[PDB]
Amino acid sequence: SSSNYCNQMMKSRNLTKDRCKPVNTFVHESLADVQAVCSQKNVACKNGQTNCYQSYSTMSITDCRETGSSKYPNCAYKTTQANKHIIVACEGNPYVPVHFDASV
């Protein structure tokens, strides 16, 4: 919990206020373009279930991963920015992303 994007955003979005979460990805694309992936390339999810979808294009993402030296209360994150295809699992109506399955 210091100044770097992952430590800041993980805190603000209530992911590390009461625990240190090991890894989390943030997508820097408009919400409706991320929701548009639910009608893009259908693929199997890691768990075999088939409600996962892979984006046609790469998207700007930041991976946040806890350092070996991180301990609650002072979570610490390595920040890695990349452009990757995201795979999300979709449910509901409207069919919207409910889980991040990976980036590729």
């Binding site: 955003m9 979005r13 209530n14 992911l15 989390n24 990805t25 943030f26 997508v27 820097h28 694309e29 408009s30 919400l31 991320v34 930041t62 999300v88 449910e91 509901g92 919207v96 992303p97 409910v98 889980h99 991040f100």
Partner: peptide, 15 residues
């Protein structure tokens, strides 16, 4: 309370 779709957005969207 928070739906699974709202939770995906709070945890992963940075539009």
């Amino acid at each position: 309370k928070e739906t699974a779709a709202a939770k995906f957005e709070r945890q992963h969207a940075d539009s």
